[PDB]
Symmetry: C3
């Protein structure tokens, strides 16, 4: 029989598991723990103390080491014998030469994981990804594999790492593994559809977890234990929306406090727009922009009243229109606070009127909120900025108070501020006024 000793967490093992299926070679799987859980008896079988190892023959049992030599043994043992290593001496040489480069790519990716907010380690990953894309382009005509439509050993050697790095590098370093390597992305995309790859691949959450051991303990997302991570600030009204959504939909997230002006030199790797909020998912995806984060939170959250009224197109319109108009209110309010323009005040008034008039139709029934008795995405969109308006006016506008001219919007503001969700999110009005005084 063939006995393969592996961890389901190990990309080197995955190489061998892919080849086995590609070649229709059967084997008995033996689970073997890694690092502290690696047993002594296994170290006696393989003194290099790594997985995989292959054991051949029942009676006179011998061992084979190293994933690429084992992969090659399996390829040489199923028909056509050796096909995965190429069909000509020229093609085989190009597969061999490629294989002799994959280790630098791996080393660069693991190096980034070990220091994920290093600029210098980020540039090394860029350069190595680009380098590999150049090797693909030099060998390819059409793609998607290294030898075009033929899946070979070149692809097997690399794919297990592409699978795990895509979510892992986004989650731990805000890095897109493919940003400098479009050809490598098309190679990964086609490889991931092959039964041999998809039936042996771990989940995105598993790829993040299985790489946790490389990442430094002080990296900002580590306290999340693989959960949703919200990059945040206690004073930012845009973040407030996300945290309101989260409180309203009982949506657990790990809060990372990012200071602002100055923000840390690394935050630009998490969001290239250098703004909070930013949400990262347990699948290693980035969800950017406060109201987009709110809408995301509302799609996947299980507990609560819906913030977006799915199933009703007209009601979805109302919420969409209020949120758009809330955007125009925000732009007007924030400009007017910071630079004090007259064009700014007029745009604030216009947008308030758009909000107020739709509030006056009560499309979500009676009650003080745009959502009626309860807050919807509309309410979440506007409330933090009404709170900012309450702090700014009339102290810092020589007497002008927007809320004297817009009673329904003042109702929504007072009723929002008085909810439990609001009081677990917002600073005190004085803290907001003080922030304005520091700013000017």
């Amino acid at each position: 029989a063939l006995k393969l000793y592996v961890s389901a967490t190990c990309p080197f093992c995955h190489r061998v598991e892919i080849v086995a299926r590609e070649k229709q070679v059967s084997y008995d799987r033996v689970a073997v723990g890694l690092r502290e859980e690696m047993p002594q008896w296994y170290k006696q079988i393989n003194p290099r103390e790594t997985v995989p190892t292959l054991e051949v023959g029942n009676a006179d049992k011998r061992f084979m080491f190293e994933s690429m030599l084992i992969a090659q043994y399996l390829d040489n043992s199923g028909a056509p014998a050796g096909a995965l290593m190429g069909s000509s001496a020229a093609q085989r040489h190009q597969i061999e030469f490629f294989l002799a480069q994959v280790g630098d790519f791996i080393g660069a990716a693991h190096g980034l994981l070990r220091d994920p907010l290093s600029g210098e380690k980020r540039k090394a990953m860029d350069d190595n990804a680009a380098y590999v894309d150049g090797l693909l382009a030099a060998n390819q005509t059409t793609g998607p594999y290294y030898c075009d439509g033929e899946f070979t050993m070149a692809d097997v050697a690399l794919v297990p790492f592409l699978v795990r790095l895509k979510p892992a590098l986004m989650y731990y370093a805000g890095y897109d593994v493919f940003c400098k390597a479009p050809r490598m992305k098309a190679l990964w995309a086609a490889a991931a559809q092959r039964a041999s790859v998809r039936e042996t691949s771990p989940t995105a959450a598993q790829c993040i977890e299985n790489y946790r051991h490389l990442v430094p303990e002080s990296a900002p997302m580590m306290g999340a234990n693989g959960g949703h991570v919200l990059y945040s600030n206690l004073f930012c009204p845009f973040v407030d929306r996300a945290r309101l959504a989260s409180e309203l939909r009982k949506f657990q997230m790990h809060i990372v406090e990012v200071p602002l002006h100055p923000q840390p030199e690394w935050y630009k790797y998490i969001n290239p727009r250098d703004t909070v909020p930013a949400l990262f998912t347990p699948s290693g995806e980035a969800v950017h922009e406060s109201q987009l984060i709110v809408q995301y939170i509302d799609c996947v959250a299980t507990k609560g009243s819906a913030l977006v009224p799915r199933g009703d197109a007209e009601k979805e319109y109302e919420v969409g229109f209020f949120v758009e108009n809330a955007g125009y209110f925000v732009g007007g309010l924030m400009s007017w606070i910071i630079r004090g323009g007259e064009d700014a005040k007029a745009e604030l008034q216009w947008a308030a009127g758009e909000l107020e008039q739709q509030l006056a139709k009560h499309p979500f029934g009676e009650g003080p909120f745009f959502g009626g008795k309860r807050m919807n995405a509309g309410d979440v969109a506007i409330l933090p900025f009404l709170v900012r308006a309450k702090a700014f006016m009339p102290e810092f506008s020589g007497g002008y108070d927007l809320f004297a001219h817009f009673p329904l919007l003042n109702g929504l503001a007072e009723a929002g501020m008085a909810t439990p969700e609001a009081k677990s999110v917002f600073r005190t009005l004085e803290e907001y006024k003080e922030h304005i005084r520091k700013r000017q």
Copy 2:
């Protein structure tokens, strides 16, 4: 009447968005035309105080904004919401992409409002590049934002790509896709979809419908969307295009581009920085003098054919004469601009090749290469025979090529006496002055 009434202009990419979604989702509506700008009626301004189209009317109540209207239609036709994505993750990607389309549109209209601005051009390069990176970050195979799946992300943008491809070329000499190959593939695929094909304006309407943005002084504005020839009254290469135009009654708006130096803006219209250049009503560029002659001869409907189509051997004949004309031109201009026996011998050889072919009379009787009238060969050479007549013998230290090549002299003479020649060429003395100015400029240091 129907449940849905849509207020639109056929000139409007924002309406095109909603019209695409209607057909994708197979949702029917009554169309109501609304005039734009000065023509917008008050009854419509009362319906939508933002004073833009589209607006949707349901039942009654109104719904504003193309992206909100598009989403209503997506949320009203099975399968409900499908254009906005099949998962939270995919829907987020679409929504983030939709939040960036505004800036692309703004960079595009920025360029149309100031089409020869380097600064607005750089900004369009950067926003196109940026859109392509967004596409690269979400795509694997393409062609759409979500690969094989057409979604709202494509719908938002497609109407602008359709109109900007011909508009940015015509008004700016700018290729909308030069920094955005993925965006090109997305456009190309979308254009073949039923929903987009059947609701698209023609290339000429695209150009017309953006004219209102373009400065009045922009150099191509007097063409009123017709053919535009970037020209100069003294350039023999331009004379070919204009002779061809006269011979085929092909209407073109002439734009006089001064030379030595040419205006800085001209390199935007032809990156080779040369005249002539022809722009078409469909917003395409046609570069190089003899290529332009050829193009004019393909699309023109009046006059005798410059290229003898339907007869392979005679088409060879013209091609051969035109190639040889090319060597004559190289020789002559090189000898006029710099002297040199190398260039003089080139001229003589080329003249000889042309003379030997005229001697075979493949187009029958007459003084022209084309017999009784001028063909593409005659058009290619004549302006250069005219420059030779001005240059020789006064500035060639006595040498007169026409004394040694009589059929080519025949061609020049008969060419110069046609009405087309007399409507195109300057006087022989004007060409002599041109030559004298050039020579003095060359002695300036």
Copy 3:
């Protein structure tokens, strides 16, 4: 009319006419004509330009057509559908015609580089024109692979014959990948090369290299190979020793190009961008890089001597694989210890020596002193040269430490290796290697 084409099978310009002929399904009588010093006077009579091709049309009224592109268009114009290879519209045709007008520049850059293959400046000029041709394709394409996407047209025909020959020839003569700056041109070639019209008229890779030899300078370093295998080499390099052992053992002929080192010539980076010897170039114009991968290539294509890799036996291929990997670690330790000292490197060397020794003691290839038993295999070849270096280095430069006193089977392998005729024809004397180590330490300071 009845057709006769004068061609050479070596000439890409004739190739163009031959491709169209097949695309259009036009028949012709082929007449071979010699080139250069072989061109006969009777053909020089027919075409005073003294170039191939020429087309003779008709048996009664013999007339001659010149120039591959004019001849190509003539065949396009007399086969149904008439003129389709020049495009289905005025617009597409214009794009085809403009592209045709740039091909000559690309040919010139490519021939200019063959004429001076190790020139940085000719190589840059080739990079830039290859990049320019790719931008033209980008500008006209939506999906590729041809200039007009799925339609094969005259733009492709004009360029394909050159790509076919230049791929092998530029690699063989210049170490240059014709497509490195032109990925779209590559897809265009790879698609055209599957068409019957192109596949059945293309010469072999070897013929492409021979047919271009006449352009390449006599002093270019691969010229003595007369198209054969070329090994860039150095008489003192143990990585090169691997390739030369494989060669000797498999009776594998190669033209040795001695490349000096420390400093290597400034052109060597063009042959191998890693700046290292050995590098192997094949008759088909492929580069084979890295010493042990060269040993493996050699062992695949050779037909004489015993196999170095035991193909057909998975388990035995594993043993050789594992030994070569472990030799890899030994080389790493040895070289690092010699060059820059250090106890880390000495421990690596020892460990690796033990991996090798333990595999030897199982004698997986049976009785005898070599890892391959009675004869050397890929394993012995990977390691012998570095055993020789080990013998030169120790104990003289290692303060008395002699690795071979601790690993007797490895010592046996070394001794028996060194006594082979193959090793005697490859290696320098031990004394020479000792000076080479001394020279390196003196060069260090």
